[PDB]
């Protein structure tokens, strides 16, 4: 990334021998708009994981059955989407 920016800047010096900057500043703000949100989500997730770590000792051995049935449900849905997409690819192959 740095080397590409450097080749670009060398070219800009070659040709040289304010709209773009404000555009760059706008995009800079834009990117981090979502990154502050990612921070918010990571922070909620970390506080929640610490909440779980509080229960972490011996707790209830039923949430395991709960998450395992959730695993059956999520794997079923993922296999649905997988077979669907693969059948669409076979459809394009036939066409």
């Amino acid at each position: 990334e740095e080397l590409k920016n450097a080749e670009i800047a060398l070219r800009t010096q070659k040709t040289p021998p304010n709209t773009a900057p404000a555009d760059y500043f706008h995009t800079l703000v834009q990117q981090f708009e979502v990154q502050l949100q990612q921070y918010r989500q990571q922070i909620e997730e970390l506080e929640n994981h610490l909440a779980t770590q509080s229960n972490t000792l011996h707790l209830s051995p039923q949430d395991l059955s709960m998450a395992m049935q959730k695993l059956y449900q999520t794997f079923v849905a993922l296999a649905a989407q997988l077979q669907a997409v693969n059948e669409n690819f076979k459809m394009l192959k036939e066409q």
Binding site: Q42, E45, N48, T52
Partner: peptide, 14 residues
Amino acid sequence: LQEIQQAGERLRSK
């Protein structure tokens, strides 16, 4: 993302 996925799910739980 599985720690963050358990985070989203358990955060939905707790």
